[PDB]
Paper text:
Herein, we describe the use of GE to optimize a fragment‐derived inhibitor of Mycobacterium tuberculosis pantothenate synthetase, an attractive target for developing new drugs against tuberculosis. The work presented here demonstrates the use of GE analysis to critically and thoroughly examine the binding distribution of a lead compound and illustrates the practicality of applying GE analysis to modify parts of a molecule that are not making efficient contributions to binding.
Consequently, 1‐ethyl‐3‐(3‐dimethylaminopropyl)‐carbodiimide (EDCI)‐mediated coupling reactions were employed to generate a series of indole acyl sulfonamide compounds (10–19; the syntheses are described in the Supporting Information). Compound 10 was the most ligand efficient compound tested. The X‐ray crystal structures of 10–13 bound to pantothenate synthetase show binding at the active site, with a conserved binding mode for the indole sulfonamide fragment core. The P1 pocket binds the alkyl groups of the pantoate substrate and is primarily lipophilic, surrounded by the hydrophobic residues Pro 38, Met 40, Val 143, Leu 146 and Phe 157. In contrast, the P2 site binds the phosphates of ATP and is relatively hydrophilic. As can be seen in Figure 2, the binding orientations of the added groups are all similar, and no new hydrogen bonds are formed.
Author numbering:
A (entry chain B): 1 to 70, 86 to 288
B (entry chain A): 3 to 291
Write the structure that this text describes.
Amino acid sequence: MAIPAFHPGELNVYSAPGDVADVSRALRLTGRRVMLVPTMGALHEGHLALVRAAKRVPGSVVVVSIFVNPPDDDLAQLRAEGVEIAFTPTTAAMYPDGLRTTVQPGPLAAELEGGPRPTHFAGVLTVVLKLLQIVRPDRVFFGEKDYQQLVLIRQLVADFNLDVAVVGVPTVREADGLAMSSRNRYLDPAQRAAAVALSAALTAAAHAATAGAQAALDAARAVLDAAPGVAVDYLELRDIGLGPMPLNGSGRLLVAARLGTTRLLDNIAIEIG
Amino acid sequence: IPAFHPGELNVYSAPGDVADVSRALRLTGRRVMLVPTMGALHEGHLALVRAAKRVPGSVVVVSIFVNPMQFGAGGDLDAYPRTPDDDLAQLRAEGVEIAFTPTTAAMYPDGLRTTVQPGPLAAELEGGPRPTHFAGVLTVVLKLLQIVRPDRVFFGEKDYQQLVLIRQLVADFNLDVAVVGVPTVREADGLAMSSRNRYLDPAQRAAAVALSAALTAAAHAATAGAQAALDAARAVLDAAPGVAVDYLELRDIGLGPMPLNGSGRLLVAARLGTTRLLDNIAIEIGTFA
Ligand SMILES: COc1ccc2c(c1)cc(C(=O)NS(=O)(=O)c1ccc(C)cc1)n2CC(=O)O
Ligand SMILES: COc1ccc2c(c1)cc(C(=O)NS(=O)(=O)c1ccc(C)cc1)n2CC(=O)O
Ligand SMILES: COc1ccc2c(c1)cc(C(=O)NS(=O)(=O)c1ccc(C)cc1)n2CC(=O)O
C-alpha cells in the first residue's frame, strides 16, 4: 500500500516491476514527467545520448531499464548522468508465466532484418510493450541506428493506441562515422577499417541525392564495392515509414553487411533531388 | 477534451474524445469503469453496467463496436445483430454517462498491422476451428483498454475462454487494469443470455434449456467424481431434440496446461439448427462439492 522508497536526486534501483510501477505512478502524481530509456546494459555513449535527451525535458525523471531480452559500471555511469531510476528486472519477473501472450508485428517485420531473424522483432515489440505498461512514461527514447526497429515501435504505438511519445535520437558515431554498436569491439583492425564504408556510403548517397535516387544508390554501392571483406546483405532506399520510396521527397537509406562474423547496420535520412 | 455533461449520456465516436474525457475524469478523482460490448445489449450487459456503477465514485464507459477483426470470411460479420437505437436507450435508462461508439476507420486506420498473438489457449475450444478469432478479440480489447485507460473492465462469464484469455493479456502485458468477471445472467429457465438467442425458433428455444440443465446436473453429480459429472451432462444433452454437441469439456479453472484438481470449469458448445450456443459452470469435484 506504501510507495516503495524513492530518494530524489539519487540513483534508485528497482528489480520488481511492481515497485518501479508504483514509484513511477507516485512521481507522475507529483508533477514529474516520466521518461523511459530502454537498454540491455553494457552502456555506451549511444545510451548516454538517449539519457541526455530525456534529461533535458523540464521536470523529467529519467528511468533507464536494463534488461537482456532472452552492472556496477552501468549504474555508476547512470549515477554520473543524474539518472534517478534504474529498473533491472530478472527474466522471471518479466516473464512469471513464461512466454504466452506476445506482440505480432505487421509485415514490415518480415523484411530487411526480419530476413535473417524472422521473429527478432516480435520479441523486441513484446518487451517494449511490457516496459511501456510497467513504467507508463510520457516519452520513450530510442536511437535511430536500428531504424526498422524504431519504425516497428512507432507502428506498435499507433496500432495499440499507446499514449506515449516515441523519440528517435540521432545515432552516435565514432570519429570516422562508424555507428556505435556493442559489436564494433569484435572487429579486428582490417575489419574495423573496412567498416567505415557503411557510413561513408550512406553520407556519399545523401549528398549524391541532388542528382536523384539512382545516383544516390549508385554512389553508396560504389563506396561499399571499394571495401574488402564487406558482404552486403541489403542496400535499400525506402520512404521514412519504410514503405516504397516516393518519386521525390523524404526517404531513408538503409544498409546491412557482414564483416567476418559480425553483422553491422547503418541508415541515413535521404532527400530526393 | 470535448464537452462532458454529467448525469447525462455523452456519446463519443472519436477515440481521442473519449481518451481525453476519461483522463480528465480520472484526474478529478472519478474511477473509470469500462464495459466493452459488441452492442445488441441485453440484461446481461445491464448487469455488467450495474456492477460497474456499484464501484464508488465510478464513471461508466460502455463501448459498442462490432469488431471486424475477430470474424472470418462468411456472413458472420454482416449477420451480427445491430440494434444501436435500443442500445443507447438502455444505457440512458441505466444512468450510463459515456458511450464510446467508434467507427471501423477510427479503430483500424491502417488496417490490420500490429496484433496480439494469444498464448496456446487460443487454439483450443472455440479457437480450434477459428484460428485468428481470439487474436482479433484481444487486439481490440487491448486497444479499448489503451484508449479508455479504465481502472476496471467488466466481462460476463458466459464466454469463459475469452475471459481467461483476457486475464492472460492483462497479466502478460503488465496492464494496469483490474479484470472483473460477472456471473452469467440467465432467462428464468436457465438459458444463458446471449445476443444469439434471437435466432432460436420456438422449438429450438425449448430444446436450448438442455445446456444449462446439463451443466447444473453435472455440478450436483460432481460429488460422485468427474466421470459422473460428465456423464450426467451428456445424458441431458442426449435427451434433447435437435441439440448437436460440438464439445463438452471439463478443465481446470484457468483452462491452462494443468490437470483438473478440486475446482474446475465445465464448458459446453452445441448447435441448434445453425445457432451455436455456449455455456459453462463452476464444478467442485468430490469433497469440494
Ligand atoms: C543514440 O545513439 C545510439 C547509437 C547506437 C545504439 C543506441 C543508441 C542504442 C543501441 C542499442 O541497441 N541499445 S540496446 O541493445 O540497449 C537496445 C536494444 C533494443 C531496444 C528496443 C532498445 C535498446 N545502439 C546500438 C548498439 O548498442 O548495438
Ligand atoms: C453478466 O451476464 C452476461 C451474460 C451473457 C453475456 C454478457 C453478460 C455479455 C455478453 C456478451 O457477449 N457481450 S458482447 O458481445 O458484447 C462482448 C463480446 C466480446 C467482448 C470482449 C465483450 C463483450 N454475453 C453473451 C452474449 O451476448 O452471447
Ligand atoms: C491454424 O490455421 C491457421 C490458418 C490461418 C491463419 C493462422 C492459422 C494464423 C494466421 C495468422 O496469424 N494470420 S495474420 O497474422 O494475418 C492475423 C493475425 C491476427 C488477426 C486478428 C487476423 C490475422 N492465419 C491467417 C493467415 O496466415 O493469413
